[PDB]
Amino acid sequence: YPVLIKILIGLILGAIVGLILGHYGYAHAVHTYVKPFGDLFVRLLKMLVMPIVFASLVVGAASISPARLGRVGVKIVVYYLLTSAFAVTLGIIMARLFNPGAGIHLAVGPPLVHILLDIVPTNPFGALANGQVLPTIFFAIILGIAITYLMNSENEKVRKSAETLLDAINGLAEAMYKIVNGVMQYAPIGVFALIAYVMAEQGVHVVGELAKVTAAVYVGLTLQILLVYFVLLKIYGIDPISFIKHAKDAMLTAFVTRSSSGTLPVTMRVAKEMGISEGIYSFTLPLGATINMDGTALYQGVCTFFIANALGSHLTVGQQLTIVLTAVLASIGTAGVPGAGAIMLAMVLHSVGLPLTDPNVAAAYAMILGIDAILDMGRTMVNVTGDLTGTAIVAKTE
Amino acid sequence: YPVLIKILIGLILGAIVGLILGHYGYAHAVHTYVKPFGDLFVRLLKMLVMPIVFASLVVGAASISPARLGRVGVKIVVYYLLTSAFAVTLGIIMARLFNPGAGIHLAVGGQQFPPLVHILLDIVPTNPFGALANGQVLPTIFFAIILGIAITYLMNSENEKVRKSAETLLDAINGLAEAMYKIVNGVMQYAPIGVFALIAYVMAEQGVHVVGELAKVTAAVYVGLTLQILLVYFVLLKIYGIDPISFIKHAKDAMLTAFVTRSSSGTLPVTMRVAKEMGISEGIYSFTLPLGATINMDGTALYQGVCTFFIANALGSHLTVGQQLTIVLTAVLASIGTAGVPGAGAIMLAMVLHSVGLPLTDPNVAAAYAMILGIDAILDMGRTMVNVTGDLTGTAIVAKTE
Amino acid sequence: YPVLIKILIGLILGAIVGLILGHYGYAHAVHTYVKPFGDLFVRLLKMLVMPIVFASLVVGAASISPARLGRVGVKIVVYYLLTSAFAVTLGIIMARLFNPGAGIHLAVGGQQFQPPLVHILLDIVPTNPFGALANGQVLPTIFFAIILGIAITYLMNSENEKVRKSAETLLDAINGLAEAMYKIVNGVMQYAPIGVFALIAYVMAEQGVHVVGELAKVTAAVYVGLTLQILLVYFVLLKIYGIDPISFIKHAKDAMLTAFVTRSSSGTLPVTMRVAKEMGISEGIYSFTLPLGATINMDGTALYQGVCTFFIANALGSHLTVGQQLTIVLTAVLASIGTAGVPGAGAIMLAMVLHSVGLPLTDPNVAAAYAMILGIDAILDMGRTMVNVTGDLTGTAIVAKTE
């Protein structure tokens, strides 16, 4: 086989092979035969997430405890908020440029505090065994700091055993990085199969008003990359073209998997092999995979308008900053799983005063939901790109 | 900030600030705003339990396998049974002294609804990873000992490759164990806020209900819990030559945590660090302390003795002029059966009631039992603190014998 | 105490003490008193499975990555398929020799109820290795343990020696745990005599006092087929490969007896792996082939199902197709692979081979005869499981000597 631009060869062919097959009613032919090969690829990547996230972040607390972590924390969080606040606003502009909703809608027919407290796991083993990335992040930092403190103990028996544990954890972290290299050998077949399904199932439904909303989303996602990331990398001195060259693997994976969390092992390997320290990326990237959802903010901003246009609400000629605010909250609230943005979109809809209980909102929401995997691909790719852009920026600041 | 007597400054202030706010109907205000801070403290301690308990016991199986473990096991178990058997008897006396139940258990209508061998067999885990991932302190204890013993045997093998790789594993386990202790030092900095907020809740909620006959039962419990410490612990430590006043000085942190948390199990990280930092060997404390967090419930045994009487007095049963040793026996059984979670003693009280012959099906027993349950957290605090103190006392005594 | 033939002293005594007690209506006396001591034994062995399987296979990827694992894999899989294909055919021959089903399956009324294949192959790759470990799940663990071990070997040859040190550290700790579990199975086998005694004591005093008449005919059919699987297949196949069959039994005694009395192929795994270790097989071979065999290679199940399909077909008077009973041969292989290392699943997986011959559990006379077999299932499971485990060791030994 040639280079690993065979992902592109599988992507273009898979889009064509898919899109054609689904038009001829063979949606279930692709699902029953091609999709399992795409699922295996996701299966392999999900596997690596839990070890790689924990193990790299424990070794991630090699760097200065007060600063770095403290500084990099505030830095990355401030970055994350501002990018998501910009992302929805850009989606609003796209939903005022394109006007997705002339026709009358088809046919008819969490305690917050108890979320913050849930960042602290009550069983680190239980958290590890149950996915649960955010609680793992917390424990891994707390452990990693403790180990560093133990290594400066006057007692050299504690210093030995603390260094021992840290190595064994590092060995495991380093092992998962060697595996993501290997799992990327299957990627072209996995990529091929994954867009093959989405095109041959939801792609043959991107017609009419649904094409208008998808056009509004994707051009907003393109303008997110160019107007925000490409600009923001340029101001920070980091070459935007060398950035995409290095981030190509994680972007394509994020686009195809639609799982920000599932793309994490290949995102962290990209950050490793672009010369960022485990001190920065072991913290920023998993956090970004749960908290920074830029393409979701844009997706929600342009979808709140879709429904409000499809019902004929004026969308408050003034107070659509309620969307902007709430879409940031929804972005953070959104999971790194490959569907949650459409589910979380419900929260920004009740913010604008149109609940899914009114059967005509539900009618238009069900119409958006039919092409969600199409919208998810580009949205997720931007979600991951936002994470890497933020990491690269903050890693240069430090 | 001053010293870590800011726990006391946070305890007194919290009990006052709570007590007042709850009297003025702001029980839900405290619950929505103050309680989460006390919950964070609990979250943080719960976090450390599983790793600290497993890892320290594996390293704790450094001591002599046949003895220590063997000898220490029998010693602590014999100790645990006797303290508990005393604790109930002391609670019976307190319930004959104070007479909690002159009035007829008023309203009626608000009712409530283990195979023993399939309990012993459950000490052996079928999946140690599963055990660790699922709480389950007891099966973990079992496995951690078996592993730690296997490691010691492995290090004395003629094959030095097996010796090197075993010694490696033991260190990494110790590294983790040691790391968790460093963390409990950190999480204790939050303790004052955590304490403040936790009594702020209980006082502002069930405290403003400790009135009348419920005050009489509370008095009887607490004076019993006081008399457990002085008559049993302070005496038993004194006879074993360990200084009782130097004992409390060291146990201050664990005792206060246990009281405020009400989780015997959740207080374990701070109890074990108190055992470490009073110079007991991991060989002893890594075994006796988590075991005592599940098997040794002294303050529960007392609570159950005095509450069996409250109910029997509220219904006017004679509480068998003679055979209330059935309580004494069954309360020990209930104590052992009780969990280190912060409610179970009230739940387990049901077992000693059916022993005396008054089930929760009779809706007048159920009426009295529901009244006790209304001030349970108030009773749970003192009860849990005494629960944990018994663990340390036992460890100190047994450690000194060995 | 004497030697570790105290297992036999406990087995013989337990079979007798049981068989007597269950005849005198004390089935529940044995269950409530003797069975917990047998259960403790099982409990203890189950405990070691997950750590020993994971850790030994990670260290097991010490051997050559492309070959060994690749070669041993194809070899053992090919071995497994051919032994299972022969096993059912042998059971067919036993079910034609003995004729289990002359009387009409009397009593009607005790009915039972009526996996997506691709969504099984994909499940071999775990989405959370910790979850996998914490949930039993031997097969996803096998996949991850290999991938991890191979990654470590690659990491130790890296030009960066910080990555080489930390990787060697991890490998050692894992080996430390692997080795620890082996020392433990040495100990848990001291309890085995009491465990064995109590376990057959139950089965004999409960299902043994029911092995009478037609059910004794079907039991006789099974056990003579299991014996001929040992003598005609294993004893022969070891002899062709040069490995001494009598020295093989001498060493495999501990794993065989355990497997027999436990009926859990998976639960016998620590004692099967320690037998393979102390007969001098490399962890590269046995740490891969034995846990795979305890999930894929069910030879005694294949035989059990072949002879049980015939039992129900004879009981209903179906001619069992004078020609196409290779449908059973094929499907019993698939049912063997499908069968779990749990101590009862072979009777449950027998339902699949019955629908392959066209006689479902919905028909109230099939469900009557199936429930009759089910009543003596543990008697059949003992010999079946022991042969299941024997097949794993035989293959491991043959494939190890090939490599």
Ligand SMILES: N[C@@H](CC(=O)O)C(=O)O
């Ligand atoms: N697929 C997105 C979530 C979403 O669809 O909003 C992600 O994981 O980033």
Ligand SMILES: N[C@@H](CC(=O)O)C(=O)O
């Ligand atoms: N919460 C107490 C048990 C009880 O309430 O009886 C403890 O764990 O010590």
Ligand SMILES: N[C@@H](CC(=O)O)C(=O)O
């Ligand atoms: N108990 C058997 C399975 C079966 O009953 O077929 C085994 O694991 O080997």
